[PDB]
């Protein structure tokens, strides 16, 4: 006799048959699910006047938490329930409106960008509505749908009001990016790129997913800012951070140029307060805002290992100190080169300098490795220069110790980033990396927020779904669609900082990675640890780079190479297959299958539309859309628990029922050698870097403690095979 409150405000008598019908629909065709389980696990507390929208959200939560190894199909039952709820939230019904009627209302409300109506006619919009297959919303998993409604679908960040559905996001991201294409082939690409992303061939990053169709145009995931040793640069760096974190960006800061504590200022007119007070200023710049209301602001700061304050900077996240010399809420990347590693192997010392007391030592540290060793040993002997010697064994032990406890002390081998990079170190060296240590692009410090001379490195991302391809030659067509869509994005979006637009338009750097690599190895019956995937990884990532280079090479023929292409090593006719670290020849014997010499000639002749193309990012959130295993990392378990704005999410590995034996889970690995070898093989072809993780299980070691010997041996093993950067250090606890 009690009443439920419908979505339109009216009421009617409570009828459990309505709930049975919904669940029977959502469980249709699924194996080993239970309508009764979902209803009983809901523990739904009825009361007179209970909202019908709250009732539905309860059974979604209940079905979502039933995702298990024994019942993996709940990932689809909860997804179908969640899509149904999301259709009502934005449209009030199940069937979405016409593409034109929606864009009209949305551009009218200021939620979409104005250009959608100007660049496409109503006859063109109706033609793309025929491309849409709204039944592809029934191929998502629950983790994918929660990331859609939580982060990607256009919504109000104060109301929580959901405005669109999934297939509209895809078709409009395709529409906006190719909106500036010629009309004889425009809709040809728009359909093709929509099909590629809606069938999970290509993965799009968070800012493209949540941005491309909205008024505010910023879709670059990574922003790299270099800071000079002046207040004007520090002020400029701070302003740029604030602007970019507010527009969906993760910052990489290079504050290594700042002179050390105690150094003279204006010849002794002032005493330098130190780096840490400025690091604190960089932190408040990052934490002042949110990344477009999608996630929180984050940044990683870089400094050379030989900096004078290096022992104080390595412990900045360490909670065992006073707040004055702690900057906990930023990650850090220690920059190391061959000479630093040599001092450890020989048990010698490492001399620390302020960059202001060693002329040319900083720039040589990146661009000229020989010039660095000359100046370093020279200044080490000079008794007039302020220095400080530390045992290399002690400095390395402190670094890895702080890396182990926080998990966020990263490593960047600066020599590898320049000796094996797409850039000429003498013209445009790589001096830093980004938040997740997968981006390596040139930067020049700023003297003002609008300083035209400085360069801020931007990189736009996307990923190839390795589990969705059946032949490596599908990448040729996929690299064309991906590179074209991203290069068009560079002209389509806005730039809050002039120095950043300069780098983005000059070099046009892209960062295309891969997802579902662990599921890819399972399909080929290979594993991380044993090294059985070495030749398969070599064959795979050769095709990824070849078809990416080829695509940008043809796009260079069509619209001209990037303005600053002459600064790349591709301009000199140098390919990744030349500059890679030769130690890879002892861990993989797979031969090159594609015609690189013809590609070398064509790049010498026509150039590249993009200075960089490939970079392997973690894809923490974006990979979940295709229910793929994130990036190149092995899944934590057959059912992984991943984070969400609402709560926790259960994600089943792809094709669990047929491949649970083929997977090698994260903690089933004996050590790091097999993984790091695969990363080293990948790095042979990747233009930029890889967000390489190191993992350690304390229970696998005597006395339950992880030895410093193993942490350092793995770190040297990574350098031996040309690994550019090191990301997270995962330490088990269970």
């Amino acid at each position: 006799n009690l009443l439920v409150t419908k979505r339109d405000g009216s009421t009617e008598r409570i009828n459990l048959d309505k709930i049975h019908r919904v669940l029977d629909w959502a469980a249709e065709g699924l194996h080993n699910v239970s309508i009764s389980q979902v209803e009983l696990r809901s523990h739904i507390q009825f009361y007179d006047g209970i909202k019908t929208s709250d009732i539905h959200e309860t059974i979604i939560k209940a079905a979502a938490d039933l995702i298990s190894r024994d019942a993996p199909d709940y990932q689809y039952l909860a997804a179908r329930l969640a899509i149904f709820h999301l259709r009502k939230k934005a449209y009030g019904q199940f069937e979405p409106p016409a593409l034109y009627d929606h864009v009209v209302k949305m551009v009218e409300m200021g939620k979409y960008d104005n250009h959608l109506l100007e660049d496409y006619t109503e006859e063109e919009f109706k033609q793309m509505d025929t491309f849409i297959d709204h039944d592809r919303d029934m191929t998502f998993s629950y983790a994918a749908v929660k990331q859609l409604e939580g982060k990607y679908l256009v919504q109000n960040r104060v109301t929580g009001e959901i405005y669109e559905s999934a297939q509209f996001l895809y078709i409009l991201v395709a529409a906006c990016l190719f909106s500036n294409y010629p009309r004889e082939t425009r809709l040809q690409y728009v359909k093709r790129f929509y099909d590629a992303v809606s069938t999970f061939k290509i993965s799009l990053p968070t800012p493209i997913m949540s941005g491309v169709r909205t008024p505010t145009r910023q879709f670059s995931s990574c922003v790299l800012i270099e800071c000079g040793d002046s207040l004007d640069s520090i002020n400029a760096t701070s302003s740029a951070i604030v602007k970019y974190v507010s527009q969906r960006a993760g910052i990489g800061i290079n504050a290594g140029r700042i002179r050390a504590l105690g150094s003279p200022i204006r010849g002794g007119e002032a005493f330098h307060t130190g780096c840490i007070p400025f690091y604190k200023h960089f932190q408040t710049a990052v934490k002042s805002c949110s990344q477009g209301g999608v996630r929180g602001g984050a940044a990683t700061l870089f400094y050379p290992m030989w900096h004078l304050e290096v022992e104080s900077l390595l412990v900045l996240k360490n909670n065992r100190g006073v707040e004055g010399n702690r900057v906990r809420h930023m990650d850090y990347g220690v920059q190391i080169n061959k000479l630093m590693y040599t001092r450890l192997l020989k048990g010698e010392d490492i001399t620390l300098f302020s960059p202001s007391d060693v002329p040319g030592l900083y720039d040589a540290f990146f661009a000229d490795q020989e010039e660095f060793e000359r100046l370093y040993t020279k200044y080490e002997k000079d008794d007039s220069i302020r220095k400080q010697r530390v045992k290399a064994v002690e400095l390395f032990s402190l670094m890895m110790q702080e890396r182990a406890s926080t998990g966020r002390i990263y490593i960047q081998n600066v020599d590898h980033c320049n000796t094996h990079s797409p850039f000429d170190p003498a013209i445009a060296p790589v001096r830093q990396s980004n938040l997740c240590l997968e981006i390596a692009l040139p930067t020049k410090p700023l003297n003002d927020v609008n300083d035209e001379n400085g360069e801020i490195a931007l990189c736009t991302l996307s990923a190839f779904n390795l589990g969705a391809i059946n032949n490596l030659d599908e990448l040729e067509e996929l690299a064309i669609l991906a590179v074209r869509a991203l290069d068009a994005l560079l002209d389509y979006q806005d730039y809050p900082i002039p120095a950043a637009k300069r780098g983005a338009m000059g070099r046009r750097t892209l960062g295309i990675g891969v997802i579902n690599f662990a599921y890819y190895l399972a399909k080929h019956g290979k594993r991380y640890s044993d090294g059985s995937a070495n030749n398969l990884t070599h064959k795979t990532f050769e095709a990824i780079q070849y078809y990416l280079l080829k695509a940008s090479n043809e796009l260079a023929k069509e619209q001209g190479a990037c303005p600053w292409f002459n600064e790349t090593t591709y301009a000199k006719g140098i390919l990744p297959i030349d500059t890679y670290k030769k130690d890879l020849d002892t861990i993989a014997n797979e031969p090159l299958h594609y015609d690189w010499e013809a590609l070398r000639e064509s790049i010498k002749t026509h150039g590249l539309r993009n200075s960089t193309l490939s970079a392997l990012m973690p894809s923490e959130t974006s990979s979940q859309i295709s229910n793929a295993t994130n990036g190149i990392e092995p899944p934590r378990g057959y059912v992984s628990i991943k984070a969400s704005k609402d709560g926790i999410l259960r994600q089943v590995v792809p094709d669990y029922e047929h491949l649970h034996d083929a997977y090698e889970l994260l903690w089933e690995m004996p050590g790091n050698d097999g993984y790091l070898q695969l990363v080293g093989i990948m790095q042979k072809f990747i233009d930029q870097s890889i967000s390489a993780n190191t993992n350690y299980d304390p229970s696998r070691f005597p006395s339950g403690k992880v030895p410093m010997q193993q942490l350092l041996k793995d770190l040297l093993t990574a350098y031996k095979f040309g690994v550019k950067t090191l990301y997270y250090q995962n330490t088990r606890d269970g």
Binding site: H31, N32, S34, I35, S36, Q37, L40, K338, Y341, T342, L344, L345, K346, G347, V393, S397, Q401, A404, F701, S703, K705, V706, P707, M708, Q709, L711, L712, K713, L716, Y719, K720
Partner: protein, 35 residues
């Protein structure tokens, strides 16, 4: 078997029917390396 194969439609009924860092370092072992 008179009926089609089927998974348990009420799986909930089964609950009622059955009951630091080892900091030591060895440089000589690390010296046996070539970067």
């Amino acid at each position: 078997l008179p009926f089609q194969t089927r998974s348990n439609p009420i799986p909930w009924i089964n609950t009622w029917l059955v009951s630091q860092i080892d900091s030591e370092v060895d440089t000589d072992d690390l010296s046996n390396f070539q970067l």
